[PDB]
Design a protein around this ligand. Sequence first.
Ligand SMILES: NC(=O)c1ccc[n+]([C@@H]2O[C@H](COP(=O)([O-])OP(=O)(O)OC[C@H]3O[C@@H](n4cnc5c(N)ncnc54)[C@H](OP(=O)(O)O)[C@@H]3O)[C@@H](O)[C@H]2O)c1
Ligand code: SF4
Lengths: 306, 152, 80, 208, 385, 111, 114
Amino acid sequence: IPHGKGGRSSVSGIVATVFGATGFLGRYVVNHLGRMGSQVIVPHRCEPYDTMHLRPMGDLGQIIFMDWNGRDKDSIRRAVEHSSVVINLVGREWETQNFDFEDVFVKIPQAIAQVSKEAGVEKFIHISHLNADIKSSSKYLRSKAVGEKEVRETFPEATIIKPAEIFGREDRFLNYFANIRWFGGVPLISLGKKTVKQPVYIVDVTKGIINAIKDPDARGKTFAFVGPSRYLLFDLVQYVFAVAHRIGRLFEISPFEPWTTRDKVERIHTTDKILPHLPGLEDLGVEATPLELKAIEVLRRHRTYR
Amino acid sequence: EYVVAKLDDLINWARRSSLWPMTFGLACCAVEMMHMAAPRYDMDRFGVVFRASPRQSDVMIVAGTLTNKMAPALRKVYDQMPEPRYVVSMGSCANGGGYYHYSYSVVRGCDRIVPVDIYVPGCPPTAEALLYGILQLQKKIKREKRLRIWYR
Amino acid sequence: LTLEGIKDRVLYVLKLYDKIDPEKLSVNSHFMKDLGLDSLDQVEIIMAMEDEFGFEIPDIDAEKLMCPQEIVDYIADKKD
Amino acid sequence: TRPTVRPRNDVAHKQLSAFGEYVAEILPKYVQQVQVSCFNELEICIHPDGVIPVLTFLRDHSNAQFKSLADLTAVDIPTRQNRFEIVYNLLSLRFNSRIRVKTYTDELTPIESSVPVYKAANWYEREIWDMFGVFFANHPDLRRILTDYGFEGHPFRKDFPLSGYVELRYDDEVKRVVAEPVELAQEFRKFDLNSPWEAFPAYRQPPE
Amino acid sequence: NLTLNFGPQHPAAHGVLRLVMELSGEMVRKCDPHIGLLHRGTEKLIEYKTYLQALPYFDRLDYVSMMCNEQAYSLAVEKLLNIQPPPRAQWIRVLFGEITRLLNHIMAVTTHALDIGAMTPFFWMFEEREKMFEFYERVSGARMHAAYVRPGGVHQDLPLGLMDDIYEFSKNFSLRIDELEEMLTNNRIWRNRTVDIGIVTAEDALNYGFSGVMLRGSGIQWDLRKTQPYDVYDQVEFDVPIGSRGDCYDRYLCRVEEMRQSIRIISQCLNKMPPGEIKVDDAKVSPPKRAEMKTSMESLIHHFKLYTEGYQVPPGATYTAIEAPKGEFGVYLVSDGSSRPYRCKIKAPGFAHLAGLDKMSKGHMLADVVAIIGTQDIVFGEVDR
Amino acid sequence: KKTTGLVGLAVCETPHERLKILYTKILDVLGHIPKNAAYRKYTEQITNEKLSMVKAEPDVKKLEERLQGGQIEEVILQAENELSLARKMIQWKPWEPLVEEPPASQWKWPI
Amino acid sequence: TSVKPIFSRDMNEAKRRVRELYRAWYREVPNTVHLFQLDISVKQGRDKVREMFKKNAHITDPRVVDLLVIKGKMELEETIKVWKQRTHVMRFFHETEAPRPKDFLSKFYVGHDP
Ligand SMILES: NC(=O)c1ccc[n+]([C@@H]2O[C@H](COP(=O)([O-])OP(=O)(O)OC[C@H]3O[C@@H](n4cnc5c(N)ncnc54)[C@H](OP(=O)(O)O)[C@@H]3O)[C@@H](O)[C@H]2O)c1
Ligand code: SF4
């Protein structure tokens, strides 16, 4: 039950559990959850130091840290046995040198579609992507839609969220551009055909979750994230060099965190403005952000004044 | 692997063998650290050198009492530190702001601004439990860099 | 030196502001007895002559103009 | 009466009864009350019309040097119908004597400041502006000392509560250290301490 | 003109005091510093406490003085309460009140000689300073911050010892002050580093309201140490130093002779202490003894009530000041008539001693300015008055 | 002597008549004030008390006794400002009676 | 009122002073927005300036407005120079604060009538 103002040091009733939560998306979401005040239970994988910058968001006693692998069961069960809701955002890009990378979007959402669901949770929310389709593209883009249906058997009502491409501060897609200081700046691939997708802004992403976390009645009715106005152009790549004026890796360097001349280069150039009959963002309001105002912030190059 | 994990018993040993601290003298907990610099409990040459420029630091120390006129200036210096950093705050007015705690203009905690790792209690910690806090910090470094990229 | 020269400059100041006036570029927009504004927004009308054509506005005459005729008239004796 | 009682003296109680008497005699324009403390102190209650010249009279003489401006303070007193109370304290160098100047005022009514009369009031006079809002007259540089840049409270009066409204916190929402409404972990439990039965006979009120 | 703010820089000294410099090429001619890094809410905070409970917040007002602060408080309270303190107690307040001056006048030279940049006189004297904190721990409660002086005189008696220790300590100290005489006085470069710097000697050196040294050592003979008594403090013999001209090097040479006075007074005070009691006997102010608060009936009711509320102070304003080892110490303690005091405004040095940095600085270099500051001996947290 | 003790002044130059002008400099300006305030009654009292012992006897050191200032060059400053004091006594009028009596209960301490 | 004013006399030395420094703010809003290296649009700053002046327009007494003049002028001393290190200027905008409900049915589900 709630009490008083939710400025800080309140209760607000809810008890969530956010896995992953070390990347760009999962950190910034929880930084709202420790503001209204709740028992945020965040288990991390293998990183005691990489959560140090996380702690000064929850006040005192509100956050807690645990260890878990994911291919084990009870480490994903012992933590979640006392909560109310649970979301998940776990996953990444290219296949590890040790992992399997296919079932990580299949059995790992199923590993928390285990007794976890049976224990008595509700409003379990997974993430999707707007472009994850069952078609033969790509090795990473498809095999995400396999988890969208084969794991949808479990949790018959979820409201699995479907975001478009996101832009914020430290993502990969927008920082894939302007990290291309090279002997040639080529677009993908010297063509202005499909560019671009829908870059929804990161405040709208974290605002959609907190409205849905006690909405109510948002289970099963899956939602889609609208982007900006409206599709986007080829001008974006020229918009980079115009205004820019042309975490547990290793001790020295990681040997392979590459630009990946593989199916990475096509997972973004496959836009797929999908079905507008999903409700999915404006009804889970209110999210309305342009691009031209937030572009000064993330871009940072040598001029810095003019 | 026995070959690769043998290496971080040098590197995670080397960082806990040479710490170059900054001190923020603000209140009466500054004076007692000077007696630790005085050669009774001689702070130098037990792994750790004396004062140093603000660029080249690893372990920052907040001592004393924070005011709202110093809350911007703390974060800016905290950004300029390099990556394997640690924050250790001595003094009972850096853990909840001692008393002065119900005052209109004192930062409540020195924890709602920076993330701090080791809490030494006390109006002045007597430069006797504070070397004990530093040997706690080198005891805290049992971490690993290998079997982090070698696992994931 | 043209007394018609300061007539064009004054009579696109007011509609360059996207506020109250609905294309009433007339010489008789008498500023809160005819035109209708805020007491503060009169001072913002005087502002756009420091950059357009250059002008000082030293004194209490900005509290005296009250019609776009007198704005031209106060630049009339300023110029010619 | 006994040991462990302070032995008072009458010599300093005599001359300080003597000296301050002919002060009101030679300026019956500004002086409205003079009183002698029972432990060799003097108050000269002055309506603040004569804020400059009476100091200027004590600035120099041949029978009263008094050129050591020690203490400018400020005391609020609610339920007086003129709240505040500016109180000086000055020292005779050649004579070893303390005397205070009690000048009342109100909030909006200004006070002619002592800037030409003394140059030790350079940082003291600004402090009352920052803490109360008592706008002194004709000071060359009025600014903000000993408070933070965004306050609107003038905190040392009584209506300003113990904590402010401005408990500060950090978030990584973008970069900023943002303000927020104030939230405590504990009440500051306020006690109740005034015992009854009136331990003091001498200061007994007019019983009405 | 370049507007550098050489201050917040944690360049040794005391990383604080952030100010501006509107320097005219090389000379400064305009200095307007900012203060308020520690305001702490002190004077508002005391308005909810009682007299005994508020007492350590006077102790933490300096960095250095532990018995010279709270000397300016109990003596500011005992006048209101018509009490003279008992005679054995007064010989201890002069003893520790003339031992804290052997802590400021060591720190006031070494820390000045560190901004300047000398290393070795910082370590050569604090290693001898350790022989003195063992006293503080042996008598009161802690390393430095001791709630030791009470309004009812001394808290408790100092134990067996501390008389063949202080006499052991003080008989081997003048050799250590003869070290720094060889280190700084006869040297030329440090003399060349400070001569004719900060020549402030006129009647605006007193119209600025300065307290001692950066007084009388520049001229005008006056002090609060033998024109105004405290306790048994006039019954000892000593002299007060005066320097020649009005610069820093003739306010430096006060402090060498000042430490050569505190050794005499300690060697004069030990010969004159009588045996006696500790507290004031009438026990409406002092608590009764521990062996008494477990036997009789009268002891507990004048024990159990004396900690729920405090004393009963009569109304009427008061004021006093004593010799802090860097200046006067004004306390204008407004009393109301209950266990909880009314307004408690303090005057500390540094209000005068640093507002007059404007006059003192100009016409000079930029490297002069850091050498100015360590001569007035300004400590922050103490400018919170 | 070459240093006057109190640093910041200079022995400049002659005693016994630099003073003797400046007392008589005040006494002529002293007559200008309308005589109803007792300011004249005490200020002319002490200057005639001073100048009688001032004029005119050796030595400088004897004039230090029975004239309770600092050194003799500083005794100039004891009355230097007093000349600047009494000439502004004509400008404002302290001999006028009291003005702005407080509203009948203000200087009572216990609230 | 047996009390002397500060600067103004009656309403006409007053209301010309609040108009006066408004231009000093008005050329300042584009001047500082590239100086303090923050990124919003500049028209939002000009809206917030007139936001502050218009709200206190319910005064029918002198020397209070004149008291706000001294408050209004002292704001420019830190503003024209650099005495507010990238935070105090951002303190004007209640940005990351959660919205107050201000609606009766909305207050009723959360809170013991705050
Ligand atoms: N919305 C979009 O536009 C978008 C774009 C690209 C990708 N995504 C996907 O949506 C989520 C956004 O993630 P992000 O942008 O914040 O970057 P991220 O670094 O991938 O964050 C997701 C977390 O999953 C963790 N993780 C990866 N493999 C794991 C495993 N086997 N076991 C446990 N944890 C694992 C990652 O590192 P740790 O193991 O150290 O915790 C990371 O902390 C991810 O699932 C991502 O694949 C979304
Ligand atoms: S209370 Fe503690 S932190 Fe604060 S000044 Fe005293 S010793 Fe330092």
